[PDB]
């Protein structure tokens, strides 16, 4: 047992707030935001000795990474920026850093009560997306 057991299923999203805002924030444009706020992602997450994979399928995109904590890749996200990312473990905390024409944005995973957490943040602006078992 290891790292991330706690994370490792398939999650489905069932709250969303602030994410319209988060978006703007990013520089999601008006058409993608639209579309891409409609859509109740499943989150996939899965451990392969030190590698960890994360799947998003949904009606817009399917999008799918695998990295090795603390190794920077290359990224190019659901809203189609080409990014580079460092994702590290914090207390229990899967810590998610992407960056892109010299801006920055972190989105934090945790596990609590049945629930998985996400936290975006893009400057002063915080989204939360919870998502529960499948
Ligand atoms: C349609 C859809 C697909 C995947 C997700 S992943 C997101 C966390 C990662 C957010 C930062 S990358 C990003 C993705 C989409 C947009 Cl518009 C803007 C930024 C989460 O809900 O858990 C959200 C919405």
């Keep these: 047992s290891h790292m991330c057991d706690a994370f490792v299923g398939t999650w489905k999203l069932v709250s969303s707030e602030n994410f319209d805002d988060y978006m703007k924030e990013v520089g999601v444009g008006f058409a993608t935001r639209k579309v891409a706020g409609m859509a109740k992602p499943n989150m996939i997450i899965s451990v392969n000795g030190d590698v960890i994979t994360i799947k998003s399928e949904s009606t817009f995109k399917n999008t799918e990474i695998s990295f090795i904590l603390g190794q920077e890749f290359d990224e190019v996200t659901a809203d189609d920026r080409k990014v580079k990312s460092t994702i590290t473990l914090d207390g229990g905390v899967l810590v998610h850093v992407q960056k ?10 945790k596990r609590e009560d049945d629930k998985l957490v996400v936290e975006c943040v893009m400057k002063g602006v915080t989204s939360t997306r919870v998502y529960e078992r499948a």
């Design 100 to 109: 892109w024409d010299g801006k920055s944005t972190t989105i934090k995973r």
